Amino acid sequence: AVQLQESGTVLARPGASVKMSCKASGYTFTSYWMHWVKQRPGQGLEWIGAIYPGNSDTSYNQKFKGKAKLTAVTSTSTAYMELSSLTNEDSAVYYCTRERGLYYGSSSFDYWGQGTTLTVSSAETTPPSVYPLAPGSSMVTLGCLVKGYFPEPVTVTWNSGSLSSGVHTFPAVLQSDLYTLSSSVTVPSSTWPSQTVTCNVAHPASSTKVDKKIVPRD
Amino acid sequence: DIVMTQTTSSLSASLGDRVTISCRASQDISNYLSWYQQKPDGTVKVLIYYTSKLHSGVPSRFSGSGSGTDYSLTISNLEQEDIATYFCQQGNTLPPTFGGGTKLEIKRADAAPTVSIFPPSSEQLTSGGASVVCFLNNFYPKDINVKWKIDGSERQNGVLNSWTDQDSKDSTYSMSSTLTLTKDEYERHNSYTCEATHKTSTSPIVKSFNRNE
């Protein structure tokens, strides 16, 4: 089986250079062009360039000349891409993908890595504040606001997972360097506030786990 | 660069349907066109290359056709696993270029949003900030607009929105909208209102929170 295994999520400071990698297996690394592709998270796919590891011939999108540097290490069947002078515009998921058809090529990509997320930010790891959402029908909706954290991700559960039906956790939005997200849960009015409802928030990056009970307000 | 345009960004369908996704190149691309499938976990697979050749291991319910500038991917009998985003890509001329992508969704009956609004918590107010949060849950179709009003006055600044992808169980969508103000400005007003415009209603769907309550 052909497999392309890319290195993990990278956080980088603005103005820096980052280097990411793509480990190829299941085929002769030196006989196929390895391409890289950028996906900014509200748009499609942009071709960066390619390297032929057999002789290190390279080819770059004009838009990425001076930005990306492609290299490959034969002994370890690993391709690298180094991106320079990082800005917010470089935050994206980057894929490595093999081109079908060996050196002769095809400009079709038959195998893809799982992607590497690059997040460029001057923010350093900081835990969220978790705020209860209580209102002030057969059903009541409650929520949690998980605000001002970095980096992604956080996980949110409700009553430790026993409330899965009727839960919505929304994708985080970026405000002023930091992420904020919300999550809602809906239960029978018969159960809240008679019973307890709690959002369990975990921010692995800051080793934080917070339990926030949702209190009635008056 | 050759421009690739996929005819739509979003396409509805029912399981068991025949589905067709098309794209168009800005010049003839000589059948050098491939189709890729991207799933929500970010993973990517090629389905078709050179217009109509099926990649090994890809189910033969996928097929491709076309010539010149115009190409289509067809799924003969849509399965659940096929709900994904599909990209076309030309390899006629460097640089290789991709279409903008077409995301499939499951078709279903219209459903009105369930709207809930929430005041800032006491914990947040102590920090000097105030966020009012509005959830608009389980609606369909996905198209929806949210307007915030403070004591009757429409408010755009300080609003952030977030949308879920289509629910795997009931095929609806949800949205969250948050208005964030300083504690001071928040305390200077009483009535906070989230109003949704959605196909399911001629008038706005309005939920309000009033500091008098």
Side-chain angles (χ1 to χ4, degrees):
Chain A
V2 171
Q3 287 181 359
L4 305 176
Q5 176 183 287
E6 294 188 62
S7 46
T9 303
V10 176
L11 316 174
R13 64 182 291 199
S17 164
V18 60
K19 185 189 274 203
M20 57 184 77
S21 61
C22 175
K23 167 74 160 65
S25 69
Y27 74 93
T28 302
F29 177 62
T30 50
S31 292
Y32 291 77
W33 286 89
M34 187 69 77
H35 298 231
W36 294 80
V37 167
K38 170 181 185 183
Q39 185 174 26
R40 290 264 295 155
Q43 222 46 255
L45 304 168
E46 182 169 41
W47 183 72
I48 292 176
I51 187 169
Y52 187 75
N55 65 9
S56 277
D57 282 346
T58 59
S59 178
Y60 294 86
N61 192 326
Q62 186 72 29
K63 300 181 172 72
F64 285 98
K65 292 178 179 168
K67 181 61 159 191
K69 186 185 299 183
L70 261 32
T71 55
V73 173
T74 293
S75 72
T76 64
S77 287
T78 302
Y80 298 81
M81 179 181 55
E82 198 161 27
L83 296 174
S84 69
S85 311
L86 291 174
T87 71
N88 306 132
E89 290 111 347
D90 296 313
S91 292
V93 178
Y94 294 83
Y95 292 90
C96 63
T97 179
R98 184 186 90 168
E99 172 176 16
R100 180 185 179 272
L102 294 95
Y103 178 92
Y104 184 92
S106 66
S107 189
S108 189
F109 306 116
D110 52 6
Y111 294 95
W112 291 65
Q114 80 277 23
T116 296
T117 294
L118 173 66
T119 302
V120 181
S121 176
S122 58
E124 297 76 345
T125 299
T126 187
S129 296
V130 176
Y131 300 130
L133 265 37
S137 284
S138 53
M139 289 218 142
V140 54
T141 291
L142 305 171
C144 284
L145 179 66
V146 180
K147 187 167 191 293
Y149 67 89
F150 181 91
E152 285 270 59
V154 301
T155 59
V156 180
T157 66
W158 288 93
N159 283 9
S160 300
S162 66
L163 295 175
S164 57
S165 198
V167 171
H168 298 285
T169 299
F170 296 87
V173 304
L174 198 40
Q175 60 179 129
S176 297
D177 299 321
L178 303 177
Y179 295 96
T180 295
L181 81 62
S182 55
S183 177
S184 79
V185 63
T186 299
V187 301
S189 302
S190 97
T191 183
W192 189 90
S194 39
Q195 301 300 300
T196 283
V197 171
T198 301
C199 69
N200 320 109
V201 177
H203 188 225
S206 62
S207 299
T208 67
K209 184 180 170 207
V210 173
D211 287 336
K212 208 69 199 205
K213 180 184 189 176
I214 313 302
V215 191
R217 280 182 72 92
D218 308 328
Chain B
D1 296 18
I2 294 185
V3 181
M4 301 299 301
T5 306
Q6 292 177 240
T7 55
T8 177
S9 51
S10 184
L11 181 64
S12 307
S14 296
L15 300 178
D17 280 355
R18 187 172 209 93
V19 185
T20 300
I21 295 174
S22 286
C23 80
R24 171 170 288 157
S26 51
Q27 69 181 262
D28 163 57
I29 61 174
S30 211
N31 292 88
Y32 287 126
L33 186 111
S34 298
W35 291 96
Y36 305 92
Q37 179 196 70
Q38 179 173 60
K39 291 185 182 173
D41 65 6
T43 186
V44 178
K45 304 277 188 295
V46 68
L47 307 165
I48 298 293
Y49 62 95
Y50 196 59
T51 293
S52 64
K53 295 182 65 81
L54 188 70
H55 183 64
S56 35
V58 176
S60 52
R61 64 179 174 274
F62 291 97
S63 66
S65 55
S67 66
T69 54
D70 287 11
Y71 301 85
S72 300
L73 172 69
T74 297
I75 314 177
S76 66
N77 203 19
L78 190 63
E79 301 278 0
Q80 182 66 237
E81 62 184 349
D82 297 340
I83 303 309
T85 302
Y86 295 85
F87 294 98
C88 63
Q89 177 251 322
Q90 66 89 18
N92 186 73
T93 306
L94 295 183
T97 49
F98 293 82
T102 303
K103 171 57 168 68
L104 297 185
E105 59 145 23
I106 293 289
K107 194 152 73 187
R108 51 108 71 226
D110 297 344
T114 293
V115 191
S116 301
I117 193 166
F118 299 88
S121 58
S122 318
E123 294 92 317
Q124 181 177 25
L125 295 162
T126 62
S127 67
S131 299
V132 189
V133 176
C134 178
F135 300 120
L136 306 91
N137 292 344
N138 302 80
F139 59 86
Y140 187 96
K142 76 188 191 71
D143 311 280
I144 195 165
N145 209 75
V146 176
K147 194 188 279 187
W148 280 93
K149 299 190 292 202
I150 299 173
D151 289 318
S153 166
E154 176 170 348
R155 174 71 167 235
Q156 297 223 24
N157 297 132
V159 177
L160 296 182
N161 296 316
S162 179
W163 300 264
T164 62
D165 294 330
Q166 183 170 52
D167 190 90
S168 71
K169 302 303 183 189
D170 70 8
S171 296
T172 66
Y173 296 88
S174 296
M175 173 186 184
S176 170
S177 184
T178 303
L179 167 63
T180 300
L181 324 167
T182 59
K183 173 164 117 133
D184 284 342
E185 178 167 20
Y186 169 81
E187 283 179 6
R188 283 200 296 271
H189 292 275
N190 291 342
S191 176
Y192 293 86
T193 298
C194 178
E195 48 175 74
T197 298
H198 190 251
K199 181 185 180 71
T200 54
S201 171
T202 304
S203 54
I205 302 141
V206 183
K207 284 304 288 194
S208 277
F209 159 83
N210 193 306
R211 287 178 65 233
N212 303 137
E213 326 191 328

Coordinates of all heavy atoms in Angstrom, one line a residue, chain A residues 127-178:
Chain A
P127 N -5.2 29.2 28.2 CA -6.4 28.5 28.5 C -7.7 29.3 28.2 O -7.7 30.5 28.4 CB -6.4 28.1 30.0 CG -5.6 29.3 30.6 CD -4.6 29.6 29.5
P128 N -8.8 28.6 27.9 CA -10.1 29.3 27.7 C -10.7 29.7 29.0 O -10.4 29.1 30.0 CB -11.0 28.2 27.0 CG -10.5 27.0 27.6 CD -9.0 27.1 27.8
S129 N -11.5 30.7 29.0 CA -12.5 30.9 30.1 C -13.8 30.2 29.6 O -14.1 30.3 28.4 CB -12.8 32.4 30.3 OG -11.6 33.0 30.8
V130 N -14.5 29.5 30.5 CA -15.7 28.8 30.2 C -16.9 29.5 30.9 O -16.9 29.5 32.1 CB -15.6 27.3 30.6 CG1 -16.9 26.6 30.3 CG2 -14.5 26.6 29.8
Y131 N -17.8 30.0 30.1 CA -18.9 30.8 30.7 C -20.2 30.0 30.5 O -20.4 29.4 29.4 CB -19.0 32.1 30.0 CG -17.8 33.0 30.2 CD1 -17.2 33.6 29.1 CD2 -17.2 33.2 31.4 CE1 -16.1 34.4 29.2 CE2 -16.1 34.0 31.6 CZ -15.6 34.7 30.5 OH -14.5 35.5 30.6
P132 N -21.1 29.9 31.5 CA -22.3 29.2 31.4 C -23.3 30.0 30.6 O -23.3 31.3 30.6 CB -22.8 29.1 32.8 CG -22.2 30.2 33.5 CD -20.9 30.5 32.9
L133 N -24.2 29.3 29.8 CA -25.2 30.0 29.0 C -26.6 29.5 29.6 O -27.0 28.3 29.3 CB -25.1 29.7 27.5 CG -24.3 30.7 26.7 CD1 -23.2 31.4 27.5 CD2 -23.8 30.1 25.4
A134 N -27.3 30.3 30.3 CA -28.6 29.9 30.9 C -29.6 30.9 30.4 O -29.3 32.1 30.3 CB -28.4 29.8 32.4
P135 N -30.8 30.5 30.2 CA -31.7 31.5 29.6 C -32.3 32.4 30.7 O -32.2 32.0 31.9 CB -32.8 30.7 29.0 CG -32.8 29.3 29.7 CD -31.5 29.3 30.6
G136 N -32.9 33.5 30.4 CA -33.6 34.4 31.3 C -34.7 35.1 30.7 O -35.6 35.6 31.4
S137 N -42.0 25.6 27.5 CA -41.8 24.6 26.5 C -41.4 23.3 27.0 O -40.9 23.1 28.1 CB -40.7 25.1 25.5 OG -41.2 26.1 24.6
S138 N -41.6 22.2 26.2 CA -41.3 20.9 26.6 C -39.7 20.7 26.6 O -39.2 19.7 27.2 CB -41.8 19.9 25.6 OG -41.4 20.2 24.2
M139 N -39.0 21.7 26.1 CA -37.6 21.6 25.9 C -36.9 22.9 26.4 O -37.4 24.0 26.1 CB -37.2 21.3 24.5 CG -37.5 19.9 24.0 SD -36.2 19.3 23.0 CE -36.2 17.6 23.5
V140 N -35.7 22.7 26.9 CA -34.9 23.9 27.2 C -33.5 23.7 26.6 O -32.9 22.6 26.7 CB -34.7 24.2 28.7 CG1 -34.3 23.0 29.5 CG2 -33.8 25.4 28.9
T141 N -33.0 24.7 26.0 CA -31.6 24.7 25.4 C -30.7 25.5 26.3 O -31.0 26.6 26.8 CB -31.6 25.3 24.0 OG1 -32.3 24.5 23.1 CG2 -30.1 25.5 23.5
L142 N -29.5 24.9 26.6 CA -28.5 25.5 27.4 C -27.2 25.6 26.6 O -27.2 25.0 25.5 CB -28.3 24.6 28.7 CG -29.5 24.4 29.5 CD1 -29.3 23.3 30.6 CD2 -30.1 25.6 30.1
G143 N -26.2 26.3 27.1 CA -25.0 26.4 26.4 C -23.7 26.7 27.2 O -23.8 27.0 28.4
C144 N -22.6 26.6 26.5 CA -21.3 27.0 27.1 C -20.6 27.8 26.1 O -20.6 27.5 24.9 CB -20.5 25.7 27.4 SG -21.0 24.9 28.9
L145 N -19.9 28.9 26.6 CA -19.1 29.7 25.8 C -17.7 29.6 26.2 O -17.3 29.9 27.4 CB -19.6 31.2 25.9 CG -18.8 32.2 25.1 CD1 -19.0 32.0 23.6 CD2 -19.3 33.6 25.5
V146 N -16.9 29.1 25.3 CA -15.5 28.8 25.6 C -14.6 29.8 24.9 O -14.4 29.7 23.7 CB -15.1 27.4 25.1 CG1 -13.7 27.0 25.3 CG2 -16.1 26.3 25.6
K147 N -14.1 30.8 25.7 CA -13.7 32.1 25.1 C -12.2 32.4 25.4 O -11.7 32.2 26.5 CB -14.5 33.2 25.6 CG -14.3 34.5 24.9 CD -15.4 35.5 25.3 CE -15.4 36.7 24.5 NZ -14.2 37.6 24.8
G148 N -11.5 32.9 24.3 CA -10.2 33.4 24.4 C -9.1 32.4 24.7 O -8.3 32.6 25.6
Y149 N -9.1 31.3 23.9 CA -8.0 30.3 24.0 C -7.1 30.2 22.8 O -7.5 30.7 21.7 CB -8.6 29.0 24.4 CG -9.5 28.4 23.2 CD1 -8.9 27.6 22.3 CD2 -10.8 28.6 23.2 CE1 -9.6 27.0 21.3 CE2 -11.6 28.0 22.1 CZ -11.0 27.2 21.2 OH -11.7 26.7 20.2
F150 N -6.0 29.6 23.0 CA -5.1 29.3 21.9 C -4.1 28.2 22.4 O -3.7 28.1 23.5 CB -4.2 30.5 21.6 CG -3.3 30.3 20.4 CD1 -3.7 30.5 19.1 CD2 -2.0 29.8 20.7 CE1 -2.8 30.3 18.1 CE2 -1.1 29.5 19.6 CZ -1.6 29.8 18.3
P151 N -3.8 27.2 21.5 CA -4.3 27.1 20.1 C -5.5 26.2 20.1 O -6.0 25.8 21.1 CB -3.2 26.5 19.4 CG -2.6 25.5 20.4 CD -2.8 26.2 21.8
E152 N -6.0 25.8 18.9 CA -7.0 24.7 18.7 C -6.3 23.4 19.0 O -5.1 23.3 18.9 CB -7.5 24.7 17.3 CG -8.5 25.8 16.9 CD -9.9 25.4 17.2 OE1 -10.2 25.0 18.4 OE2 -10.7 25.4 16.3
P153 N -7.1 22.4 19.4 CA -8.5 22.4 19.7 C -8.9 22.4 21.1 O -8.1 22.4 22.0 CB -8.9 21.1 19.1 CG -7.8 20.2 19.5 CD -6.5 21.0 19.5
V154 N -10.2 22.6 21.4 CA -10.8 22.2 22.7 C -11.8 21.1 22.4 O -12.3 20.9 21.3 CB -11.6 23.4 23.3 CG1 -10.7 24.6 23.6 CG2 -12.8 23.8 22.5
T155 N -12.2 20.3 23.4 CA -13.3 19.4 23.3 C -14.3 19.8 24.4 O -14.0 20.2 25.5 CB -12.9 18.0 23.6 OG1 -12.3 17.9 24.9 CG2 -11.8 17.5 22.5
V156 N -15.6 19.6 24.0 CA -16.7 19.9 24.9 C -17.6 18.7 24.9 O -18.0 18.2 23.9 CB -17.5 21.2 24.4 CG1 -18.6 21.4 25.4 CG2 -16.6 22.4 24.3
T157 N -18.0 18.3 26.1 CA -19.0 17.2 26.3 C -20.0 17.8 27.3 O -19.8 18.8 27.9 CB -18.4 15.9 26.8 OG1 -17.9 16.0 28.1 CG2 -17.3 15.4 25.9
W158 N -21.1 17.1 27.4 CA -22.2 17.5 28.4 C -22.5 16.3 29.3 O -22.8 15.2 28.8 CB -23.4 17.9 27.6 CG -23.2 19.2 26.9 CD1 -22.8 19.5 25.6 CD2 -23.4 20.5 27.5 NE1 -22.7 20.8 25.4 CE2 -23.1 21.5 26.5 CE3 -23.8 21.0 28.7 CZ2 -23.2 22.8 26.7 CZ3 -24.0 22.3 28.9 CH2 -23.7 23.3 27.9
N159 N -22.6 16.6 30.6 CA -22.7 15.5 31.6 C -21.9 14.3 31.2 O -22.3 13.1 31.3 CB -24.2 15.1 31.7 CG -25.0 16.2 32.5 OD1 -24.5 17.2 32.8 ND2 -26.2 15.8 32.9
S160 N -20.6 14.6 30.9 CA -19.6 13.6 30.6 C -19.9 12.6 29.5 O -19.5 11.5 29.5 CB -19.3 12.8 31.9 OG -18.8 13.7 32.9
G161 N -20.8 13.0 28.6 CA -21.0 12.3 27.4 C -22.4 11.7 27.3 O -22.9 11.3 26.2
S162 N -23.1 11.6 28.4 CA -24.4 11.0 28.5 C -25.5 11.8 27.8 O -26.6 11.3 27.6 CB -24.8 10.8 30.0 OG -25.0 12.0 30.6
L163 N -25.2 13.1 27.5 CA -26.0 13.9 26.7 C -25.2 14.1 25.4 O -24.3 14.9 25.3 CB -26.2 15.3 27.3 CG -27.0 15.3 28.6 CD1 -27.0 16.8 29.1 CD2 -28.4 14.9 28.4
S164 N -25.6 13.3 24.4 CA -24.9 13.4 23.1 C -26.0 13.8 22.1 O -25.7 14.7 21.3 CB -24.3 12.0 22.7 OG -25.3 11.0 22.7
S165 N -27.2 13.2 22.1 CA -28.3 13.6 21.3 C -28.6 15.1 21.7 O -28.5 15.5 22.8 CB -29.5 12.8 21.6 OG -30.5 12.9 20.6
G166 N -28.9 15.9 20.7 CA -29.3 17.3 20.9 C -28.2 18.2 21.3 O -28.5 19.3 21.9
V167 N -27.0 17.8 21.0 CA -25.8 18.7 21.3 C -25.3 19.3 20.0 O -25.1 18.6 19.0 CB -24.7 18.0 22.0 CG1 -23.4 18.9 22.0 CG2 -25.1 17.6 23.4
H168 N -24.9 20.6 20.0 CA -24.2 21.2 18.9 C -23.0 21.9 19.4 O -23.1 22.8 20.2 CB -25.1 22.2 18.2 CG -26.4 21.6 17.6 ND1 -26.3 20.9 16.4 CD2 -27.6 21.7 18.0 CE1 -27.6 20.5 16.1 NE2 -28.4 21.0 17.1
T169 N -21.8 21.5 18.9 CA -20.6 22.3 19.3 C -20.2 22.9 18.0 O -20.0 22.3 17.0 CB -19.5 21.4 19.8 OG1 -20.0 20.7 21.0 CG2 -18.3 22.2 20.1
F170 N -20.0 24.3 18.0 CA -19.8 25.0 16.8 C -18.3 25.3 16.6 O -17.5 25.4 17.5 CB -20.5 26.4 17.0 CG -22.0 26.2 17.0 CD1 -22.6 26.0 18.2 CD2 -22.8 26.2 15.9 CE1 -24.0 25.8 18.3 CE2 -24.1 26.1 15.9 CZ -24.8 25.8 17.1
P171 N -17.9 25.3 15.3 CA -16.5 25.6 15.0 C -16.0 26.9 15.6 O -16.8 27.9 15.6 CB -16.5 25.7 13.5 CG -17.6 24.9 13.0 CD -18.7 25.0 14.1
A172 N -14.8 26.9 16.2 CA -14.3 28.1 16.8 C -14.1 29.2 15.8 O -13.8 28.9 14.6 CB -13.0 27.8 17.5
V173 N -14.3 30.4 16.3 CA -13.9 31.6 15.5 C -12.8 32.3 16.1 O -12.6 32.3 17.3 CB -15.1 32.6 15.3 CG1 -16.3 31.9 14.8 CG2 -15.5 33.2 16.7
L174 N -12.0 33.1 15.3 CA -10.8 33.8 15.8 C -11.2 35.2 16.0 O -11.7 35.9 15.1 CB -9.7 33.6 14.7 CG -8.2 33.9 15.0 CD1 -7.8 33.4 16.4 CD2 -7.4 33.2 13.9
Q175 N -11.0 35.7 17.3 CA -11.2 37.1 17.6 C -10.0 37.6 18.3 O -9.7 37.2 19.4 CB -12.5 37.4 18.4 CG -12.7 36.7 19.7 CD -14.0 37.0 20.5 OE1 -14.7 36.1 20.9 NE2 -14.3 38.3 20.6
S176 N -9.3 38.6 17.8 CA -8.2 39.3 18.4 C -7.2 38.3 18.9 O -6.8 38.2 20.1 CB -8.7 40.0 19.7 OG -9.6 41.1 19.3
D177 N -6.6 37.5 17.9 CA -5.6 36.5 18.2 C -6.1 35.2 18.8 O -5.4 34.1 18.6 CB -4.5 37.0 19.2 CG -3.8 38.3 18.7 OD1 -3.5 38.4 17.5 OD2 -3.6 39.2 19.6
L178 N -7.2 35.2 19.5 CA -7.6 34.0 20.2 C -8.9 33.4 19.7 O -9.7 34.1 19.0 CB -7.8 34.4 21.7 CG -6.6 35.1 22.4 CD1 -7.0 35.5 23.8 CD2 -5.4 34.1 22.4

